Design a protein around this ligand. Structure first.
Ligand SMILES: [Ca+2]
Lengths: 223, 56
């Protein structure tokens, strides 16, 4: 997250870290045994880390649980990045409390202008590299489909939305993929792709979760 | 020769560590891959990298 602020220990209880020997993507806990992330974060040997703040030191609130299954959307397109969503089943259920909790799926899609909270342990520099120890947060508004399509001609599908600032300076970056975009307490997006980080006129692009609620609920129930 | 191409992170925001052949140093080095749209100078291990590009 470029241009954000330190969230504060366990203030984003649904945020998870996907670890394969190191943090490589984020994810959101939707219920005690399932996590939602991006399809491009698919990897073998994933260990899910819950209750994390400082990802480099054991602070005592963590729960490390291996993934038993990783289900990438059947129509995910690695070229166009359409349907960039994946569900990860935990080998065992997490113990939910105030430091670890699930986030609600949306009842409907959010509109342009809605303010949302984006979080992650990704790069904090637009020009350079600086990975944080603690979780970073960013408040950004959802942008209109029209402006999103103007920023990325012929690349935006009905399953994607832009969020951020056209001036640049505040955005998601490498290491934030799969993380949550929460608006009004509901999970509306998944950090997906963009053009560099925090560049002017190039807001981040996110997977539009409201279009997959039916698929998520049914998939979780039959696995 | 794809072995001489600079490493390509891509548009996606993951932080996946991969290898690429660095012809200037004459060895395979690590770089951050974003998770999508990989070019060919992108390997999962140093061994794969050396086997494919070693001495290019
Ligand atoms: Ca920790």
């Amino acid at each position: 997250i470029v241009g954000g602020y330190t969230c504060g220990a366990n203030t984003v209880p649904y945020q998870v870290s996907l670890n394969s020997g190191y943090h490589f993507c984020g994810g959101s806990l939707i219920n005690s045994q399932w996590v939602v992330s991006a399809a491009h974060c698919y990897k073998s040997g994933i260990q899910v880390r819950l209750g994390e703040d400082n990802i480099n030191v054991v602070e005592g609130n963590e729960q490390f649980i291996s993934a038993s299954k990783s289900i990438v959307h059947p129509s995910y397109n690695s070229n166009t990045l359409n349907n960039d969503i994946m569900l990860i089943k935990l080998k065992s259920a997490a113990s939910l409390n105030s430091r670890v909790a699930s986030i609600s799926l949306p009842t409907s899609c959010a509109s342009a202008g809605t303010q949302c909270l984006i979080s992650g342990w990704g790069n904090t520099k637009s020009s350079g590299t600086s990975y944080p120890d603690v979780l970073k947060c960013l408040k950004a508004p959802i942008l209109s489909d029209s402006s999103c399509k103007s920023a990325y001609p012929g690349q935006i599908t009905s399953n994607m939305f832009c969020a951020g600032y056209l001036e640049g300076g505040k955005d998601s970056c490498q290491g934030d993929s799969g993380g949550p975009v929460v608006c009004s307490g509901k999970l509306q997006g998944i950090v997906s792709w963009g053009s560099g980080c925090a560049q002017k006129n190039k807001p981040g692009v996110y997977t539009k979760v409201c279009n997959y609620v039916s698929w998520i609920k049914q998939t979780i129930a039959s696995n | 020769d794809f072995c001489l191409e600079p490493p390509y992170t891509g548009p996606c925001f993951a932080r996946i560590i991969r290898y690429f052949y660095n012809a200037k140093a004459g060895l395979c080095q690590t770089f951050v891959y974003g998770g999508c749209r990989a070019k060919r100078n992108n390997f999962k291990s140093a061994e794969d990298c050396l086997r494919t590009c070693g001495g290019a």
